[PDB]
PDB file of C-alpha atoms and ligand atoms in Angstrom:
ATOM      1  CA  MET P   1       8.413   8.578  25.511  1.00 18.95           C
ATOM      2  CA  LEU P   2       5.669   6.579  23.750  1.00 16.35           C
ATOM      3  CA  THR P   3       7.670   4.476  21.289  1.00 19.16           C
ATOM      4  CA  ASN P   4       8.038   0.716  21.955  1.00 18.72           C
ATOM      5  CA  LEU P   5       6.743   0.985  25.540  1.00 17.86           C
ATOM      6  CA  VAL P   6       6.418  -2.882  25.359  1.00 17.28           C
ATOM      7  CA  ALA P   7       8.989  -4.904  23.488  1.00 13.56           C
ATOM      8  CA  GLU P   8       7.923  -7.567  20.953  1.00 13.09           C
ATOM      9  CA  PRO P   9       9.989 -10.501  19.402  1.00 14.67           C
ATOM     10  CA  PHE P  10      10.301  -8.997  15.898  1.00 18.86           C
ATOM     11  CA  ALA P  11      13.889 -10.194  15.651  1.00 17.61           C
ATOM     12  CA  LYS P  12      13.047 -13.860  16.131  1.00 17.64           C
ATOM     13  CA  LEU P  13      10.200 -13.602  13.561  1.00 20.29           C
ATOM     14  CA  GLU P  14      12.506 -12.105  10.902  1.00 19.91           C
ATOM     15  CA  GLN P  15      15.180 -14.613  11.734  1.00 19.60           C
ATOM     16  CA  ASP P  16      12.761 -17.559  11.146  1.00 22.22           C
ATOM     17  CA  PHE P  17      11.657 -15.817   7.892  1.00 23.93           C
ATOM     18  CA  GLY P  18      15.320 -15.530   6.764  1.00 22.42           C
ATOM     19  CA  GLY P  19      15.220 -11.861   5.914  1.00 23.79           C
ATOM     20  CA  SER P  20      14.212  -8.357   7.321  1.00 23.30           C
ATOM     21  CA  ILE P  21      10.835  -7.175   8.493  1.00 24.85           C
ATOM     22  CA  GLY P  22       9.903  -3.423   8.862  1.00 26.15           C
ATOM     23  CA  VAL P  23       6.975  -2.282  10.997  1.00 25.89           C
ATOM     24  CA  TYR P  24       5.501   0.985  11.920  1.00 21.23           C
ATOM     25  CA  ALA P  25       2.156   1.234  13.866  1.00 21.55           C
ATOM     26  CA  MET P  26       0.467   4.352  15.164  1.00 22.71           C
ATOM     27  CA  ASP P  27      -2.439   4.557  17.744  1.00 17.60           C
ATOM     28  CA  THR P  28      -4.067   7.792  16.609  1.00 15.75           C
ATOM     29  CA  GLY P  29      -5.618   8.374  19.895  1.00 14.57           C
ATOM     30  CA  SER P  30      -2.777   8.634  22.135  1.00 15.69           C
ATOM     31  CA  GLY P  31       0.078   8.857  19.660  1.00 15.19           C
ATOM     32  CA  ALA P  32       1.833   5.671  20.922  1.00 17.83           C
ATOM     33  CA  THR P  33       3.770   3.711  18.339  1.00 19.84           C
ATOM     34  CA  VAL P  34       5.475   0.374  17.691  1.00 21.05           C
ATOM     35  CA  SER P  35       8.583   0.667  15.514  1.00 19.53           C
ATOM     36  CA  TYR P  36      10.962  -1.983  14.138  1.00 19.83           C
ATOM     37  CA  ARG P  37      13.302  -1.174  11.229  1.00 17.64           C
ATOM     38  CA  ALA P  38      10.817   1.590  10.543  1.00 19.60           C
ATOM     39  CA  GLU P  39      13.141   3.957   8.780  1.00 21.37           C
ATOM     40  CA  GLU P  40      14.772   1.463   6.538  1.00 21.06           C
ATOM     41  CA  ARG P  41      13.766   1.434   2.833  1.00 21.36           C
ATOM     42  CA  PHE P  42      11.856  -1.440   1.383  1.00 20.82           C
ATOM     43  CA  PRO P  43      10.444  -1.917  -2.192  1.00 21.00           C
ATOM     44  CA  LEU P  44       6.885  -0.670  -2.665  1.00 25.10           C
ATOM     45  CA  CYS P  45       5.889  -3.317  -5.225  1.00 24.63           C
ATOM     46  CA  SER P  46       2.188  -2.936  -6.040  1.00 26.42           C
ATOM     47  CA  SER P  47       1.594  -1.033  -2.818  1.00 25.90           C
ATOM     48  CA  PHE P  48       2.271   2.174  -4.706  1.00 26.44           C
ATOM     49  CA  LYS P  49      -1.205   1.868  -6.286  1.00 26.34           C
ATOM     50  CA  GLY P  50      -2.929   2.944  -3.143  1.00 21.72           C
ATOM     51  CA  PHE P  51      -1.212   6.249  -3.126  1.00 20.18           C
ATOM     52  CA  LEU P  52      -1.773   6.603  -6.929  1.00 19.56           C
ATOM     53  CA  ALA P  53      -5.545   6.452  -6.299  1.00 17.87           C
ATOM     54  CA  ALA P  54      -5.228   9.057  -3.585  1.00 16.28           C
ATOM     55  CA  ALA P  55      -3.379  11.301  -5.972  1.00 16.05           C
ATOM     56  CA  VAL P  56      -6.148  10.821  -8.543  1.00 17.06           C
ATOM     57  CA  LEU P  57      -8.765  11.775  -5.845  1.00 17.09           C
ATOM     58  CA  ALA P  58      -6.682  14.844  -5.001  1.00 14.76           C
ATOM     59  CA  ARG P  59      -6.721  15.953  -8.568  1.00 13.19           C
ATOM     60  CA  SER P  60     -10.443  15.500  -8.845  1.00 11.70           C
ATOM     61  CA  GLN P  61     -10.925  18.173  -6.180  1.00 10.10           C
ATOM     62  CA  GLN P  62      -9.963  20.699  -8.758  1.00  8.92           C
ATOM     63  CA  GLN P  63     -11.421  18.777 -11.807  1.00  8.03           C
ATOM     64  CA  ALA P  64     -15.022  18.062 -11.051  1.00  6.26           C
ATOM     65  CA  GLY P  65     -15.469  15.807 -14.095  1.00  8.82           C
ATOM     66  CA  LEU P  66     -12.257  13.742 -13.662  1.00 11.25           C
ATOM     67  CA  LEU P  67     -13.675  10.666 -12.013  1.00 13.23           C
ATOM     68  CA  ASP P  68     -16.430  10.108 -14.543  1.00 15.43           C
ATOM     69  CA  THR P  69     -14.209  10.480 -17.551  1.00 11.00           C
ATOM     70  CA  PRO P  70     -14.259   7.437 -19.860  1.00  6.80           C
ATOM     71  CA  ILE P  71     -10.848   6.065 -20.773  1.00  8.96           C
ATOM     72  CA  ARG P  72     -10.423   3.730 -23.792  1.00 12.44           C
ATOM     73  CA  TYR P  73      -7.348   1.559 -24.199  1.00 11.93           C
ATOM     74  CA  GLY P  74      -5.955  -0.972 -26.725  1.00  7.51           C
ATOM     75  CA  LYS P  75      -4.911  -4.582 -26.268  1.00  6.96           C
ATOM     76  CA  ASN P  76      -1.308  -3.493 -25.849  1.00  9.24           C
ATOM     77  CA  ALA P  77      -2.283  -1.885 -22.551  1.00  7.89           C
ATOM     78  CA  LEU P  78      -3.241  -5.260 -21.032  1.00  5.11           C
ATOM     79  CA  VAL P  79      -0.219  -6.644 -19.096  1.00  3.22           C
ATOM     80  CA  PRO P  80      -0.174  -9.677 -16.817  1.00  2.00           C
ATOM     81  CA  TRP P  81      -2.570  -9.412 -13.794  1.00  2.00           C
ATOM     82  CA  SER P  82      -5.152  -7.030 -15.213  1.00  2.00           C
ATOM     83  CA  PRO P  83      -8.161  -8.974 -13.987  1.00  2.00           C
ATOM     84  CA  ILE P  84     -10.705  -6.050 -14.147  1.00  2.00           C
ATOM     85  CA  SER P  85      -9.477  -4.048 -17.214  1.00  2.00           C
ATOM     86  CA  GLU P  86      -9.211  -7.067 -19.398  1.00  2.00           C
ATOM     87  CA  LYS P  87     -13.092  -7.393 -19.085  1.00  2.00           C
ATOM     88  CA  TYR P  88     -13.673  -3.868 -20.363  1.00  2.28           C
ATOM     89  CA  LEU P  89     -11.068  -3.833 -23.207  1.00  2.00           C
ATOM     90  CA  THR P  90     -13.830  -3.479 -25.748  1.00  2.00           C
ATOM     91  CA  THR P  91     -15.807  -0.776 -23.837  1.00  2.00           C
ATOM     92  CA  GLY P  92     -13.423   1.390 -21.790  1.00  2.00           C
ATOM     93  CA  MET P  93     -13.658   2.290 -18.108  1.00  2.00           C
ATOM     94  CA  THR P  94     -13.930   5.479 -16.171  1.00  2.00           C
ATOM     95  CA  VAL P  95     -11.094   7.001 -14.120  1.00  4.00           C
ATOM     96  CA  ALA P  96     -12.893   6.102 -10.947  1.00  2.83           C
ATOM     97  CA  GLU P  97     -13.360   2.473 -12.143  1.00  4.97           C
ATOM     98  CA  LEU P  98      -9.749   2.281 -13.057  1.00  2.52           C
ATOM     99  CA  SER P  99      -8.760   3.623  -9.594  1.00  2.00           C
ATOM    100  CA  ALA P 100     -10.989   1.167  -7.748  1.00  2.00           C
ATOM    101  CA  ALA P 101      -9.469  -1.749  -9.841  1.00  2.00           C
ATOM    102  CA  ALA P 102      -5.840  -0.580  -9.049  1.00  2.00           C
ATOM    103  CA  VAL P 103      -6.636  -0.480  -5.320  1.00  2.00           C
ATOM    104  CA  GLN P 104      -8.955  -3.505  -4.938  1.00  2.00           C
ATOM    105  CA  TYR P 105      -7.581  -5.973  -7.523  1.00  2.00           C
ATOM    106  CA  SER P 106      -4.019  -4.472  -7.919  1.00  2.00           C
ATOM    107  CA  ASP P 107      -4.937  -4.252 -11.589  1.00  2.00           C
ATOM    108  CA  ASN P 108      -1.753  -3.536 -13.558  1.00  2.00           C
ATOM    109  CA  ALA P 109      -3.198  -2.132 -16.735  1.00  2.00           C
ATOM    110  CA  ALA P 110      -5.405   0.220 -14.731  1.00  2.00           C
ATOM    111  CA  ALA P 111      -2.458   1.572 -12.694  1.00  2.00           C
ATOM    112  CA  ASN P 112      -0.383   2.177 -15.727  1.00  2.00           C
ATOM    113  CA  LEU P 113      -3.158   4.190 -17.356  1.00  2.00           C
ATOM    114  CA  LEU P 114      -3.579   6.231 -14.225  1.00  2.00           C
ATOM    115  CA  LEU P 115       0.088   6.779 -13.827  1.00  2.00           C
ATOM    116  CA  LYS P 116       0.301   8.131 -17.240  1.00  2.00           C
ATOM    117  CA  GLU P 117      -2.506  10.549 -16.469  1.00  2.00           C
ATOM    118  CA  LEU P 118      -0.745  11.981 -13.357  1.00  2.00           C
ATOM    119  CA  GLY P 119       2.547  12.544 -15.255  1.00  2.00           C
ATOM    120  CA  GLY P 120       4.382   9.303 -14.554  1.00  2.00           C
ATOM    121  CA  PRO P 121       6.565   8.294 -11.506  1.00  2.00           C
ATOM    122  CA  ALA P 122       7.761  11.912 -10.967  1.00  2.00           C
ATOM    123  CA  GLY P 123       4.112  13.079 -10.825  1.00  2.00           C
ATOM    124  CA  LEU P 124       3.143  10.524  -8.191  1.00  2.00           C
ATOM    125  CA  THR P 125       6.324  11.452  -6.104  1.00  2.00           C
ATOM    126  CA  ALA P 126       5.365  15.127  -6.464  1.00  2.00           C
ATOM    127  CA  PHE P 127       2.037  14.364  -4.882  1.00  2.00           C
ATOM    128  CA  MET P 128       3.651  12.696  -1.944  1.00  2.00           C
ATOM    129  CA  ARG P 129       5.914  15.572  -1.476  1.00  2.00           C
ATOM    130  CA  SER P 130       2.857  17.850  -1.452  1.00  2.00           C
ATOM    131  CA  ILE P 131       1.506  16.034   1.685  1.00  2.00           C
ATOM    132  CA  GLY P 132       4.888  16.255   3.381  1.00  2.00           C
ATOM    133  CA  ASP P 133       6.268  12.830   2.576  1.00  2.00           C
ATOM    134  CA  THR P 134       9.982  13.302   1.831  1.00  2.00           C
ATOM    135  CA  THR P 135      10.878   9.525   1.811  1.00  2.00           C
ATOM    136  CA  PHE P 136       8.584   8.074  -0.928  1.00  2.00           C
ATOM    137  CA  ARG P 137      10.063   7.703  -4.318  1.00  2.00           C
ATOM    138  CA  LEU P 138       8.617   6.155  -7.536  1.00  2.00           C
ATOM    139  CA  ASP P 139      11.231   5.942 -10.380  1.00  2.00           C
ATOM    140  CA  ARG P 140      10.048   3.401 -12.946  1.00  2.00           C
ATOM    141  CA  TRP P 141       6.899   2.177 -14.725  1.00  2.00           C
ATOM    142  CA  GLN P 142       5.210  -1.048 -14.038  1.00  2.00           C
ATOM    143  CA  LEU P 143       6.940  -4.395 -14.391  1.00  2.00           C
ATOM    144  CA  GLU P 144      10.276  -2.785 -14.043  1.00  2.00           C
ATOM    145  CA  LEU P 145       9.690  -1.122 -10.697  1.00  2.00           C
ATOM    146  CA  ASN P 146       9.302  -4.506  -8.918  1.00  2.00           C
ATOM    147  CA  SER P 147      12.951  -5.605  -9.302  1.00  2.00           C
ATOM    148  CA  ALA P 148      13.508  -5.222  -5.476  1.00  2.00           C
ATOM    149  CA  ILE P 149      17.279  -5.214  -5.935  1.00  2.00           C
ATOM    150  CA  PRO P 150      19.209  -5.230  -2.546  1.00  2.00           C
ATOM    151  CA  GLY P 151      20.423  -1.752  -1.712  1.00  2.00           C
ATOM    152  CA  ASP P 152      18.557  -0.052  -4.626  1.00  2.00           C
ATOM    153  CA  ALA P 153      16.549   2.976  -3.412  1.00  2.00           C
ATOM    154  CA  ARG P 154      14.446   3.188  -6.607  1.00  2.00           C
ATOM    155  CA  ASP P 155      10.705   2.645  -6.051  1.00  2.00           C
ATOM    156  CA  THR P 156      10.923   2.381  -2.231  1.00  2.00           C
ATOM    157  CA  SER P 157       9.731   3.975   0.898  1.00  2.00           C
ATOM    158  CA  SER P 158       9.895   3.295   4.619  1.00  2.00           C
ATOM    159  CA  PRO P 159       7.335   1.679   6.880  1.00  2.00           C
ATOM    160  CA  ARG P 160       7.204   4.875   8.930  1.00  2.00           C
ATOM    161  CA  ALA P 161       6.563   7.207   5.865  1.00  2.00           C
ATOM    162  CA  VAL P 162       4.012   4.848   4.433  1.00  2.00           C
ATOM    163  CA  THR P 163       2.033   4.884   7.790  1.00  2.00           C
ATOM    164  CA  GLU P 164       2.413   8.696   8.221  1.00  2.00           C
ATOM    165  CA  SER P 165       1.090   9.311   4.662  1.00  2.00           C
ATOM    166  CA  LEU P 166      -1.711   6.870   5.019  1.00  2.00           C
ATOM    167  CA  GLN P 167      -2.811   8.522   8.202  1.00  2.00           C
ATOM    168  CA  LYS P 168      -2.873  12.051   6.529  1.00  2.00           C
ATOM    169  CA  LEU P 169      -4.883  10.745   3.524  1.00  2.00           C
ATOM    170  CA  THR P 170      -7.416   8.475   5.377  1.00  2.00           C
ATOM    171  CA  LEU P 171      -7.871  10.309   8.659  1.00  2.00           C
ATOM    172  CA  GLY P 172      -6.142  13.719   8.468  1.00  2.00           C
ATOM    173  CA  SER P 173      -6.728  16.675   6.088  1.00  2.00           C
ATOM    174  CA  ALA P 174      -4.702  15.928   3.098  1.00  2.00           C
ATOM    175  CA  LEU P 175      -7.777  15.127   1.030  1.00  2.00           C
ATOM    176  CA  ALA P 176     -11.224  16.838   1.216  1.00  2.00           C
ATOM    177  CA  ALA P 177     -13.899  15.008   3.127  1.00  2.00           C
ATOM    178  CA  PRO P 178     -15.787  13.369   0.290  1.00  2.00           C
ATOM    179  CA  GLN P 179     -12.597  12.199  -1.352  1.00  2.00           C
ATOM    180  CA  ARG P 180     -11.087  11.011   1.953  1.00  2.00           C
ATOM    181  CA  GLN P 181     -14.147   8.731   2.502  1.00  2.00           C
ATOM    182  CA  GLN P 182     -13.878   7.489  -1.137  1.00  2.00           C
ATOM    183  CA  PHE P 183     -10.232   6.522  -0.551  1.00  2.00           C
ATOM    184  CA  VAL P 184     -11.220   4.673   2.684  1.00  2.00           C
ATOM    185  CA  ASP P 185     -14.051   2.984   0.911  1.00  2.00           C
ATOM    186  CA  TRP P 186     -11.707   1.773  -1.776  1.00  2.00           C
ATOM    187  CA  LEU P 187      -9.200   0.387   0.727  1.00  2.00           C
ATOM    188  CA  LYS P 188     -12.114  -1.318   2.697  1.00  2.00           C
ATOM    189  CA  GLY P 189     -13.128  -3.046  -0.630  1.00  2.00           C
ATOM    190  CA  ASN P 190      -9.654  -4.645  -1.215  1.00  2.00           C
ATOM    191  CA  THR P 191      -9.775  -8.279  -2.199  1.00  2.00           C
ATOM    192  CA  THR P 192      -6.090  -9.212  -2.202  1.00  2.00           C
ATOM    193  CA  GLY P 193      -5.179  -8.906   1.588  1.00  2.00           C
ATOM    194  CA  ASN P 194      -7.169 -11.557   3.401  1.00  2.00           C
ATOM    195  CA  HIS P 195      -4.119 -13.402   4.528  1.00  2.00           C
ATOM    196  CA  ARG P 196      -1.999 -10.348   5.640  1.00  2.00           C
ATOM    197  CA  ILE P 197      -2.950  -7.531   8.118  1.00  2.00           C
ATOM    198  CA  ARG P 198      -6.643  -8.548   7.935  1.00  2.00           C
ATOM    199  CA  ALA P 199      -5.763 -12.018   9.322  1.00  2.00           C
ATOM    200  CA  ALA P 200      -4.563 -10.314  12.475  1.00  2.00           C
ATOM    201  CA  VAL P 201      -7.826  -8.098  12.923  1.00  2.00           C
ATOM    202  CA  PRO P 202     -11.024  -9.493  14.486  1.00  2.00           C
ATOM    203  CA  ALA P 203     -14.001  -9.811  12.159  1.00  2.00           C
ATOM    204  CA  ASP P 204     -16.022  -7.186  13.943  1.00  2.00           C
ATOM    205  CA  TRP P 205     -13.673  -4.366  13.219  1.00  2.00           C
ATOM    206  CA  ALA P 206     -13.485  -2.357  10.028  1.00  2.00           C
ATOM    207  CA  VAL P 207     -10.298  -2.427   8.072  1.00  2.00           C
ATOM    208  CA  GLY P 208      -8.969  -1.279   4.628  1.00  2.00           C
ATOM    209  CA  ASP P 209      -5.598  -2.154   3.084  1.00  2.00           C
ATOM    210  CA  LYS P 210      -3.358  -2.328   0.061  1.00  2.00           C
ATOM    211  CA  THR P 211      -0.923  -5.157  -0.693  1.00  2.00           C
ATOM    212  CA  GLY P 212       2.318  -5.541  -2.601  1.00  2.00           C
ATOM    213  CA  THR P 213       4.313  -8.608  -3.816  1.00  2.00           C
ATOM    214  CA  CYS P 214       7.332  -8.159  -5.970  1.00  2.00           C
ATOM    215  CA  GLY P 215       7.978 -11.869  -6.737  1.00  2.00           C
ATOM    216  CA  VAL P 216      11.750 -11.751  -5.922  1.00  2.00           C
ATOM    217  CA  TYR P 217      13.992 -11.368  -3.003  1.00  2.00           C
ATOM    218  CA  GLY P 218      11.346 -12.400  -0.436  1.00  2.00           C
ATOM    219  CA  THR P 219       9.744  -8.979  -0.975  1.00  2.00           C
ATOM    220  CA  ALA P 220       6.115  -8.328   0.005  1.00  2.00           C
ATOM    221  CA  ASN P 221       4.039  -5.860   2.018  1.00  2.00           C
ATOM    222  CA  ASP P 222       0.705  -4.606   3.321  1.00  2.00           C
ATOM    223  CA  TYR P 223      -0.432  -1.283   4.796  1.00  2.00           C
ATOM    224  CA  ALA P 224      -3.803  -0.717   6.564  1.00  2.00           C
ATOM    225  CA  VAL P 225      -6.138   1.482   8.656  1.00  2.00           C
ATOM    226  CA  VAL P 226      -7.945  -0.444  11.294  1.00  2.00           C
ATOM    227  CA  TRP P 227     -10.996   0.756  13.402  1.00  2.00           C
ATOM    228  CA  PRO P 228     -11.155  -1.290  16.691  1.00  2.00           C
ATOM    229  CA  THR P 229     -14.560  -0.730  18.240  1.00  2.00           C
ATOM    230  CA  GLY P 230     -14.692   1.699  21.103  1.00  2.00           C
ATOM    231  CA  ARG P 231     -11.360   3.407  20.507  1.00  2.00           C
ATOM    232  CA  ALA P 232      -9.316   5.457  18.033  1.00  2.00           C
ATOM    233  CA  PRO P 233      -8.141   3.984  14.737  1.00  2.00           C
ATOM    234  CA  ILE P 234      -4.738   2.323  14.196  1.00  2.00           C
ATOM    235  CA  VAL P 235      -2.594   2.918  11.164  1.00  2.00           C
ATOM    236  CA  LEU P 236       0.156   0.485  10.330  1.00  2.00           C
ATOM    237  CA  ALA P 237       2.545  -0.807   7.613  1.00  2.00           C
ATOM    238  CA  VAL P 238       4.409  -4.143   7.378  1.00  2.00           C
ATOM    239  CA  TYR P 239       7.148  -4.548   4.800  1.00  2.00           C
ATOM    240  CA  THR P 240       9.545  -7.453   4.070  1.00  2.00           C
ATOM    241  CA  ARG P 241      12.597  -8.398   1.998  1.00  2.00           C
ATOM    242  CA  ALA P 242      15.300 -11.053   1.889  1.00  2.00           C
ATOM    243  CA  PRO P 243      18.898 -11.316   0.605  1.00  2.00           C
ATOM    244  CA  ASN P 244      18.607 -13.858  -2.238  1.00  2.00           C
ATOM    245  CA  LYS P 245      16.621 -13.413  -5.532  1.00  2.00           C
ATOM    246  CA  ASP P 246      14.825 -16.769  -5.079  1.00  2.00           C
ATOM    247  CA  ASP P 247      13.906 -16.328  -1.522  1.00  2.00           C
ATOM    248  CA  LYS P 248      10.076 -16.701  -1.028  1.00  2.00           C
ATOM    249  CA  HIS P 249       7.831 -14.097   0.539  1.00  2.00           C
ATOM    250  CA  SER P 250       5.415 -15.121   3.281  1.00  2.00           C
ATOM    251  CA  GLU P 251       1.852 -13.888   3.904  1.00  2.00           C
ATOM    252  CA  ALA P 252       1.956 -15.612   7.400  1.00  2.00           C
ATOM    253  CA  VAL P 253       4.963 -13.526   8.469  1.00  2.00           C
ATOM    254  CA  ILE P 254       3.091 -10.350   7.575  1.00  2.00           C
ATOM    255  CA  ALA P 255       0.035 -11.355   9.673  1.00  2.00           C
ATOM    256  CA  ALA P 256       2.270 -12.352  12.598  1.00  2.00           C
ATOM    257  CA  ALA P 257       4.034  -9.047  12.424  1.00  2.00           C
ATOM    258  CA  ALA P 258       0.699  -7.178  12.432  1.00  2.00           C
ATOM    259  CA  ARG P 259      -0.368  -9.156  15.509  1.00  2.00           C
ATOM    260  CA  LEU P 260       2.850  -8.251  17.330  1.00  2.00           C
ATOM    261  CA  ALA P 261       2.216  -4.545  16.440  1.00  2.00           C
ATOM    262  CA  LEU P 262      -1.272  -4.634  17.841  1.00  2.00           C
ATOM    263  CA  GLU P 263      -0.058  -6.379  20.965  1.00  2.00           C
ATOM    264  CA  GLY P 264       2.712  -3.725  21.384  1.00  2.00           C
ATOM    265  CA  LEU P 265       0.071  -1.047  21.253  1.00  2.00           C
ATOM    266  CA  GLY P 266      -2.094  -2.764  23.914  1.00  2.00           C
ATOM    267  CA  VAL P 267      -5.028  -3.264  21.485  1.00  2.00           C
ATOM    268  CA  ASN P 268      -6.946  -6.340  22.581  1.00  2.00           C
ATOM    269  CA  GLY P 269      -7.757  -8.420  19.514  1.00  2.00           C
TER     270      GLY P 269
HETATM  271  C1  O2F F 301       0.666  -9.878  -9.434  1.00  2.00           C
HETATM  272  C2  O2F F 301      -0.143  -8.983  -8.699  1.00  2.00           C
HETATM  273  C3  O2F F 301       0.262  -7.460  -8.515  1.00  2.00           C
HETATM  274  C4  O2F F 301       1.801  -7.213  -8.244  1.00  2.00           C
HETATM  275  C5  O2F F 301       2.021  -6.138  -7.263  1.00  2.00           C
HETATM  276  O1  O2F F 301       2.659  -6.223  -6.218  1.00  2.00           O
HETATM  277  C6  O2F F 301       2.384  -6.572  -9.477  1.00  2.00           C
HETATM  278  C7  O2F F 301       3.941  -6.586  -9.345  1.00  2.00           C
HETATM  279  O2  O2F F 301       2.010  -7.344 -10.620  1.00  2.00           O
HETATM  280  N1  O2F F 301      -0.405  -7.070  -7.206  1.00  2.00           N
HETATM  281  C8  O2F F 301      -0.816  -8.115  -6.631  1.00  2.00           C
HETATM  282  C9  O2F F 301      -1.385  -7.938  -5.231  1.00  2.00           C
HETATM  283  O3  O2F F 301      -2.167  -8.834  -4.865  1.00  2.00           O
HETATM  284  O4  O2F F 301      -1.004  -6.972  -4.600  1.00  2.00           O
HETATM  285  C10 O2F F 301      -0.609  -9.439  -7.202  1.00  2.00           C
HETATM  286  S1  O2F F 301       0.758 -10.310  -6.388  1.00  2.00           S
HETATM  287  C11 O2F F 301      -0.171 -11.636  -5.551  1.00  2.00           C
HETATM  288  C12 O2F F 301       0.775 -12.581  -4.700  1.00  2.00           C
HETATM  289  N2  O2F F 301       0.845 -13.870  -5.435  1.00  2.00           N
HETATM  290  C13 O2F F 301      -0.145 -13.861  -6.472  1.00  2.00           C
HETATM  291  C14 O2F F 301       0.614 -14.127  -7.830  1.00  2.00           C
HETATM  292  O5  O2F F 301      -0.004 -14.779  -8.774  1.00  2.00           O
HETATM  293  N3  O2F F 301       1.797 -13.553  -8.137  1.00  2.00           N
HETATM  294  C15 O2F F 301       2.207 -13.273  -9.486  1.00  2.00           C
HETATM  295  C16 O2F F 301       2.780 -13.187  -7.124  1.00  2.00           C
HETATM  296  C17 O2F F 301      -0.924 -12.576  -6.544  1.00  2.00           C
END
């Protein structure tokens, strides 16, 4: 079949890193894939916020005024790493602005406000089930969901399910066309991923992504849609973890894993 037609040295990369690397990459033209630990669970960390914004967009298809609704919040809503929402504490922000901040700056207060609107972790999980993702689970609220405990399935997904859901939302039919392009535009505008998948992608190709970094257990990640010129887009996810709480994550390992995935698919970059 079309999985791992060309072998790549993922095992040496993760051994040098001192942990585990999980990769799934899909060439949406031919259906060829690269897969390494692709069905293992890894912590989502902040990467859940991309799917949160897609769930908001889905709701907006049946609530025409949702995106422009102004949301006010108190100082108690501001938690560490809320770089956009802290600048609008005294004014409020719209649902769309909160969604953009959650995707593009990983804004934590914004993500918490939107998670509340959707009915909490079970509400986001229900949205993912509604698009056919049976792997994703969000269980806790922010700044508890990033514990990344070895063997704990809470607040995890697999690289494969992340990629499959990302494809459905950005390129498939899970969102209506205007909402689909809005999701793509938010991902393209991300500011936090320059040293991850984007570092493996030539400058003349379009790319959108969402990052995550738990801060413990060498756990960090990135997922992306990439548009190489002259061929069909590629969807991919790269997740890492490591055995010890104080093990450090590595952005360079994520970029290197993305390069290996593109090489395995025969995409010249
Ligand atoms: C803290 C942000 C947030 C995160 C989600 O994973 C949640 C748990 O706060 N999202 C971020 C993302 O850029 O994705 C950033 S972590 C980034 C990697 N080192 C930087 C740093 O100063 N650290 C606290 C780790 C920024």
